[PDB]
Each structure stands twice: as structure tokens, then as C-alpha cells.
Write a protein that binds this ligand. Sequence first.
Ligand code: HEM
Ligand SMILES: C[C@H](CCC(=O)O)[C@H]1CC[C@H]2[C@@H]3CC[C@@H]4C[C@H](O)CC[C@]4(C)[C@H]3CC[C@]12C
Ligand code: NA
Length: 396
Amino acid sequence: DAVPAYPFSLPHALDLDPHYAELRRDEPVSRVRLPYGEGTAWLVTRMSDARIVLGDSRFSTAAATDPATPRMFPTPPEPDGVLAQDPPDHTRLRRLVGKAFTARRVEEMRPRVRSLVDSLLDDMVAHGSPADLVEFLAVPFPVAVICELLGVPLEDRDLFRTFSDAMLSSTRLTAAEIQRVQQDFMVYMDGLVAQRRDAPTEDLLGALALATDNDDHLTKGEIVNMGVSLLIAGHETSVNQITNLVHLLLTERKRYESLVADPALVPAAVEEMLRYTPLVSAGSFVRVATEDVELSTVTVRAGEPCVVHFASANRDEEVFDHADELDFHRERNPHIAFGHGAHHCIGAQLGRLELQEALSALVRRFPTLDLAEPVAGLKWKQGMLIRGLERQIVSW
Ligand code: HEM
Ligand SMILES: C[C@H](CCC(=O)O)[C@H]1CC[C@H]2[C@@H]3CC[C@@H]4C[C@H](O)CC[C@]4(C)[C@H]3CC[C@]12C
Ligand code: NA
């Protein structure tokens, strides 16, 4: 078969492969070969189509767990993972921990999160300028937040960051290597919830331990696997996204200067750079049509897999004026940086708060901030399902 391989190309900095603009204009729904599984998938590049694939009961992710189904990552999907559940099983699984992630309960974290940020920026001005913003902010801040929310010990970071780094592989590690790390993270998370046995905690692992023997409708595999999911996504998205938003702000300093001048524009800026930033390297957890579904240019047939490119939907010229331009004064911004439908990011309010508090602190305290390492030498992460910087040396 002569369907193109997807991803089309190895990524460059925070650039979109220019084939997405071509596909959105002339072939918004096209067949591709994903790097793992067997067969072909439909790639969905336009926002209207992405809302159907992500938003409709006729598309199942549970159906995508067969080792033969195309997928973006080397290991077959974990059948007990939240992404691989369809409603109503998925809806019952989300209720295990949803109370903690409501806009209302996340907003209540702002005082402790601001205070965490300030402490780490205090430590960075102690080191003095220039310093690596990865080591001083992007890693320690999200890590501290997800460790206090879940109740994972902070001194256990190198341990779970090693595990997260491997399980975020697109092409860096082989299936066998990742399989082994998944088993190691499984028993690690199972031991963390099992310590709550005769010792209940007021944290999310506490709630997961009470569910282990008060639910009879949730399996232990599903419960422990939620802990693993939240610990990985709950820091790795944010880590990368801090370095991504700072890169966009310092490479056209005009943006940074605009937020220095009016720090109240940070929340809108965060939504615009969420839209603009291709955090997700390529595709998505696969959705398999369970019936024929009409998309813009094609009827997908029952049994045909589909994949969305979130970044491409976020550049759709039919949804956003001057889509390929960064605009913090944009009036409407219905981006899907956080997805759409059942699997809409559970952590979306926490990612927003962490990005708001990280830039707001920077823009207020360090108006003089600039990149202090050549742009050509920037160490973009290679072979992972997300994009971001290994290191970002800044001066002030
Ligand atoms: C800047 C931050 C973040 C971005 C850009 C991001 C992006 C995404 C995207 C695009 C999805 C949809 C995947 C799909 O439907 O196939 C998603 C789902 C998810 N995200 Fe986030 N996320 C972020 C922060 C977080 C945080 C802070 C957490 C946890 C605290 C988290 C946990 C999850 C989980 C568990 C899912 C799967 C939910 C489900 O299947 O119901 N993410 N995220
Ligand atoms: C490895 C984890 C599974 C553990 C398990 O269930 O055994 C899953 C659960 C949530 C997932 C992330 C969701 C958001 C993003 C989606 C995008 O399409 C790809 C990147 C993105 C950051 C994912 C990476 C893989 C994660 C962390
Ligand atoms: Na998949």
C-alpha cells in the first residue's frame, strides 16, 4: 500500500509540518500508516471533523486496544487505562478522582501554587543569571504540584521521571524496553496505594485506596493505572508546556514585552499559546468507528480507525482568523489543546493554573528575561509523544 507514513517527518522546534495546511485545504481526511500496529488509519486535520471523532459514541477507544490496531506508540494500549475506556465505563472511572480536578477545587490551589512558584524563583535568583529554566522552574514546579495533589513523595522524582520519560516514547525506546518500565511503574503505584491500607491519606492516592475495597464496579488494575496516568500526564505536559510558552515569548520578544506591560493578559496569552503550540507530536489515541460516521469529505466505515492531529485543528482557518499568527487579543478561542468529548483532559484546569502562575511570576519579576543560548543549539526532545526543551538557559 501507498498510504503515507505518519508522522510525515521528524519535528522541527515548535513548527507544524507544512503538509497539515495542505491537507486542511485539499484533503482534510486522508489515509496514513501509523508507526505501530497493522493497517491504515484516517488522519483528521480540521476542527469540525476532530469534534466528531473525539465527541461521538460511534467512535470507541476500547476497540483500539487490540495489538493489531494502528497506534502512535510502540506498546499496545493498556486496556485498564482511562483513554481506552468508552462511556459509560469511562464516566464511572472518571468519578474516581474528578472532584479534585473541577475548576472550583483547582482554583482553591492557586495560593499554594503561587507560593511554590515564588520559592523556586527565589532559588533561581540565588543561583544568579544565567540559569537553566528547566532545572529551576519547568521540572521542579509541576512535579511539586502533582506530588502534593496525589501524595507521591517529592524525593521519589528521579525514580518516576525515569519511568515517565520511557512511557512517553514515540520512537526513542523499543516496545520491550517500555513494557518493562510499565510493569515497574505498575508495582510502584500499587505499593503507593497499598500503603494507605491501615493509614488513610487526604490526597488522591487516599481516594484510590478507599476505591480498592469500597467500589466493586472498578477493578484494581483500573484504579492503580489511574495513579500512573495522573502522575505522568500531571507533570510531563506542564513541564514541556512551560518551556514551550517561554520559547514562543522570547523568540519574538514582542510577546514577552506585551505581558510585562499588562500581566492581566497572561490568562488569554496562555489560551492562545495552548492553541498555537504543537505539544502533542503527532496523532492521538486511536478511535475506531463502531458504525459508519459522516465526516466532512468521507463516510468512515464501522471498523476503520481514525486519529486527530490536535495542533492542526488548532490552526483551522475556518475557526480562527489569521490562525498561523499568535494573538493574545483574539476574541473567540475554542481550541482543543486539551482535546474534546469524553476524554477531554481531566487536568485542564490544573494545566491552565500552573501555566498562568508560572508566566505571571516571570513577567512580573523578570522583565529583562532573555534566551542566553543560541536558538540553533536548543535541545528539542526527540522520539517522544510530546515536544519541549531538555534545557533553556535564560538571563535576566
Ligand atoms: C498543559 C497541560 C496539558 C495539556 C496540553 C494536556 C493535553 C491533553 C490532551 C490533548 C488530552 C486528550 C487525549 C485524547 O483524547 O486522545 C488529554 C487527556 C488527558 N490528560 Fe491532559 N493535558 C495537560 C495537562 C494534564 C494534567 C495536568 C493532567 C493530570 C493532572 C493530565 C491528565 C490527562 C489525562 C489523565 C487524560 C486522559 C483523560 C481521559 O481519557 O478521560 N493532563 N490531555
Ligand atoms: C502513558 C499514559 C498511559 C498509562 C496507562 O494507562 O497505562 C498516558 C495517559 C494519559 C496520556 C497523555 C494524554 C495527553 C496527551 C495525548 C496525546 O495524544 C499524546 C501525549 C499525551 C501527553 C499523553 C501521553 C501518554 C499518557 C500520559
Ligand atoms: Na492508540
